[PDB]
């Protein structure tokens, strides 16, 4: 897949494109074997693409310069230069992992520099072959007659080594490198590079390496990522740095830091561990584009990562993700079919969307320049929906002027009026729930029979788990109505720890005695309260700080607020079950109607809950389609 309407060109064409190779004061147009590590940026209207020019071989340990192409016509035509050249000291002299920051009309490029080491940088025993260099480009725009003509003057690189400490909290240092791709200017004007760093134990980890003074001098924030986080990419989001890391053979870790990387906190309630590196999350990781942009007046993030069905380092099926830090939408595949396409950089300029990404066959790497027309289409469509539901809900005037607004902060998923034969549609278009034995009713579904119910997938989302936040905190809200008295004790709503629904984290059931059975974790279940057949009730499950609550009609049940997470291990929620288990495997027959399921990524406060309870007649999506 590349969208309908989208298109591309082979901009850095492997074993074809030539570059001004300078050595001993003579320049030669030289063919390049492979191009890798793309970074696509916009400098004051001038599109600039920076990458690895790997001259003879694709290998990381080979002769490599840093190539820059720039266009003044949104990528129709380009000029080519080398921005940073290596030492020429040996056949493996190289400037590696170029990482780019744009500020004003200046391009700050940060590269590793090696002279003759043949082993991978992380396995080195000391820093003898290494320098870290900062080179700056000045971008200029002239206009003869009608015609726009740019030029970029590159500075001689400067070593930043003097800013590299001997010791970081309780370990000794070896080397460090940029995260590759595009870094940022913090809203306070600091230059911020997320960097990968090795200690003497040859562990890798990520830090924040920043300059407060336009890159004259550089500091490291005190804290770090966990070990094995490499190739970090960062963006700034509501005053915090969000650092998104490659972790080989594990799911991507994401961190927040409000204090320029002095303290790092794992973003468990949003994006951390959402993205897996491969279906089974058991393969090598990747370089990711991760940018904050404003599209259709909404502030959003765009993330890319290959799905890597092939496994090993092939990294086929480059995917684009859209997030508002609440909802996570898979825009789709950007690469074309089963082609290998790992590293990527996404640029949003003048309301048009572009991507510079790798294509790899047989370890010969090109970079394509893709006009993501169809992708923007979808993005714009999804945002519209998000804006509209959110608007719709805030717009509701609640019961006794108007009461407090319906909350949409941390509102992630909404199951309401729209449903297909086998699926209940998320209003926010991110994660549907599947259904069986479901009959459509206003704003929800009537279920009946064995195996009846709806399943909202959590860990069961598979390779990318957008709902992973629920393991730390969530609120699940729904309107329910019971139509038949059960022969045992039947399920209504809950968070399942196993794929059958047997083992629950937190849930609600109802019994033959006309009582509620709130289930807190593995705690012996004590039935409480009473319900009558055919009356509609408001059900709220909240879980935060390992404690679960259950509210009926906005009142917590007796015995509510118990520990559901015994050890200090994290839960791994299988799915949410609604109106049954949706397993023919379980013997229960839940005959109920559920309406307006809401999912929030935090615990709702007493007032937000109470609002929702009074508003249950007017939150539904029925009218609006």
């Amino acid at each position, epitope marked *: 897949s590349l969208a309908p309407g989208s298109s591309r060109v082979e901009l850095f064409k492997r074993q074809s494109s030539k570059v001004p190779f300078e050595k001993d004061g003579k320049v030669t147009e030289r063919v390049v074997h492979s191009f890798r590590l793309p970074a696509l940026v916009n400098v004051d209207g001038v599109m600039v693409a920076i990458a690895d020019a790997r001259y003879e071989t694709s290998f990381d340990n080979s002769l490599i310069d840093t190539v820059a192409k720039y266009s003044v016509d949104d990528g129709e035509t380009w000029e080519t230069q080398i921005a940073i050249k290596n030492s020429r000291a040996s056949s493996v002299s190289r400037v590696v992992d170029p990482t780019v920051i744009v500020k004003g009309n200046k391009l700050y490029v940060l590269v590793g520099s090696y002279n003759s080491s*043949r082993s991978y940088w992380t*396995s080195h025993g*000391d820093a003898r072959d290494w320098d870290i260099l900062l080179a700056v480009g000045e971008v200029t725009k002239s206009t003869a007659g009608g015609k726009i003509t740019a030029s970029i003057k590159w500075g001689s690189p400067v070593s930043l080594k003097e800013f590299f400490p001997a010791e970081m909290e309780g370990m000794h240092t070896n080397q460090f490198l940029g995260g590759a791709g595009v870094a940022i200017v913090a809203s306070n004007g600091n230059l911020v590079y997320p960097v990968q760093v090795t200690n*003497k134990k*040859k*562990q890798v980890f990520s830090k924040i390496f920043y300059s407060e003074d336009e890159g004259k001098t550089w500091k490291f924030g005190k804290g770090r990522s966990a070990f094995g986080c490499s190739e970090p990419v960062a963006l700034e989001w509501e005053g915090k740095l969000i650092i998104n890391t490659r972790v*080989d*053979y594990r799911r991507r870790l994401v961190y927040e830091s409000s204090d320029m990387g002095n303290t790092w906190l794992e973003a468990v309630g949003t994006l951390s561990r959402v993205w897996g590196p491969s279906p089974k999350s058991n393969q090598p990781g990747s370089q990711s584009s991760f940018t904050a942009v404003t599209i259709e007046g909404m502030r959003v993030m765009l993330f890319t990562h290959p799905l890597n069905f092939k496994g*090993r380092w092939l990294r086929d099926r480059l995917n684009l993700w859209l997030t508002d830090n609440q909802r996570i939408y898979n825009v789709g595949q950007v690469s074309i079919g089963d082609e290998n396409s790992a590293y990527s950089s996404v640029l949003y300029k003048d309301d048009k969307l572009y991507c510079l990404h790798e294509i790899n066959s047989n370890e010969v790497y090109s970079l394509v320049f893709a006009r993501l027309v169809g992708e923007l289409r979808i993005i714009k469509s999804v945002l519209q929906s998000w804006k509209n539901w959110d608007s719709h809900l805030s717009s509701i005037c609640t019961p006794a002027g108007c009461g407090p607004a319906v909350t949409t902060v941390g509102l992630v998923g909404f199951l309401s009026h729209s449903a297909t034969k086998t699926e209940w549609e998320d209003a926010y278009r991110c994660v549907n729930a599947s259904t069986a034995n479901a009959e459509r009713v206003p704003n929800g579904l009537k279920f009946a029979g064995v195996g009846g119910g709806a399943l909202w997938p959590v860990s069961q989302q598979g390779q990318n788990q957008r709902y992973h936040f629920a393991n730390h905190a969530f609120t699940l809200v729904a309107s329910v109505t019971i139509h038949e008295v059960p022969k045992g004790a039947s399920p209504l709503l809950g968070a399942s720890l196993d794929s059958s629904g047997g083992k629950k984290l937190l849930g609600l059931s109802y019994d033959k005695r006309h009582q509620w059975q709130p289930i807190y974790g593995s705690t012996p279940v004590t039935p409480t309260g009473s319900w009558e057949m055919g009356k509609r009730y408001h059900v709220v499950l909240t879980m935060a700080n390992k404690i679960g609550s259950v509210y009926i009609d906005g009142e917590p049940l007796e015995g509510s607020g118990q520990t559901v997470v015994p050890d200090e291990r994290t839960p791994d929620i299988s799915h949410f079950y609604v109106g049954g288990y949706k397993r023919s495997g379980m013997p229960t027959d839940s005959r109920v109607t559920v309406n307006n399921v809401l999912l929030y990524n935090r615990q709702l406060n007493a007032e937000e809950i109470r609002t929702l309870f009074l508003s249950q007649d007017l939150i539904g999506t029925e009218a609006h389609m």
Partner: antibody, heavy 117, light 107 residues
Framework: VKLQQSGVELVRPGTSVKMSCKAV???????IGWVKQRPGHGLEWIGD????????NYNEKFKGKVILTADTSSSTAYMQLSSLTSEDSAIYYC????????????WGQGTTLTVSS | DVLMTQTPTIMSASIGEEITLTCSAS?????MHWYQHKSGTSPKLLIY???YLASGVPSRFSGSGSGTFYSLTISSVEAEDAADYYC?????????FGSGTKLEIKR
């Protein structure tokens, strides 16, 4: 470049020994590592110590037993083994762990240790 | 502790023929080293960083491999090539050696 280790050792269980590994053809700053070779047991990595830096990486299996040191003026590394047992009876080799991916190219001649009553 | 599994334990090879030894890492590493060991001597470095030939080692010895599985090959074996062979990674701590494969000559 070369590594010259100390002489044959014979000791009663429970004592201590300190092995040397000094290089002639002297080079400037590097990791010197230690390997235990026992029959039936291939080669076991003990640890490296960094001549002209002091940094050490211990293999945790040997946490109690081994203490590494280095006099970087005379450029000699010392391995010391505490509270010995027939377990520790082996040939001990030192070698230099080249910076470029840490391979051991120059090895010592080996120091043979015998722990017996 | 990436564990290095060298299979099989003992391998036979006829004079002048080629043979390959394997080394199978529990987890991915940047590269392998290979050593020859004959009891009484010290270990001898044969291949460093996966594929480069140590100085003075005869070019019948070849090195290949990638990520999780590496190979040592003798172009055409010599009587004297009967020995123990060890693979070795030091790409993550702690450094670990192979289980070792012994070469027997067929005659």
């Amino acid at each position: 470049v070369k590594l010259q280790q100390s002489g044959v050792e014979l000791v009663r269980p429970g004592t201590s020994v300190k092995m040397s590994c000094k290089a002639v053809g002297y080079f400037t700053y590097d990791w010197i590592g230690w390997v235990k070779q026992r029959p039936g047991h291939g080669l076991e990595w003990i640890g490296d110590i960094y001549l002209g830096g002091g940094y050490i990486n211990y293999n945790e299996k040997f946490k109690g037993k081994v203490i590494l040191t280095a006099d970087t003026s005379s450029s000699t590394a010392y391995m010391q083994l505490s509270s010995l047992t027939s377990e520790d009876s082996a040939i001990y080799y030192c070698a230099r762990g080249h910076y470029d991916g840490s391979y051991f190219d120059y090895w010592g001649q080996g120091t043979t240790l015998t722990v017996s009553s | 502790d990436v564990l290095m599994t060298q299979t099989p334990t003992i391998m036979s090879a006829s004079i002048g023929e080629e043979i390959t030894l394997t080394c199978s890492a529990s987890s991915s590493v940047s590269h392998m080293h290979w050593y020859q060991h004959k009891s009484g001597t010290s270990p001898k470095l044969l291949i460093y960083i996966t594929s480069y030939l140590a100085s003075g080692v005869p070019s019948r010895f070849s090195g290949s491999g990638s990520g999780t599985f590496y190979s040592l090959t003798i172009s055409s074996v010599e009587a004297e090539d009967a020995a123990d062979y060890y693979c070795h990674q030091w790409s993550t701590f702690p450094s670990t050696f192979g289980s070792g494969t012994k070469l027997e000559i067929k005659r």
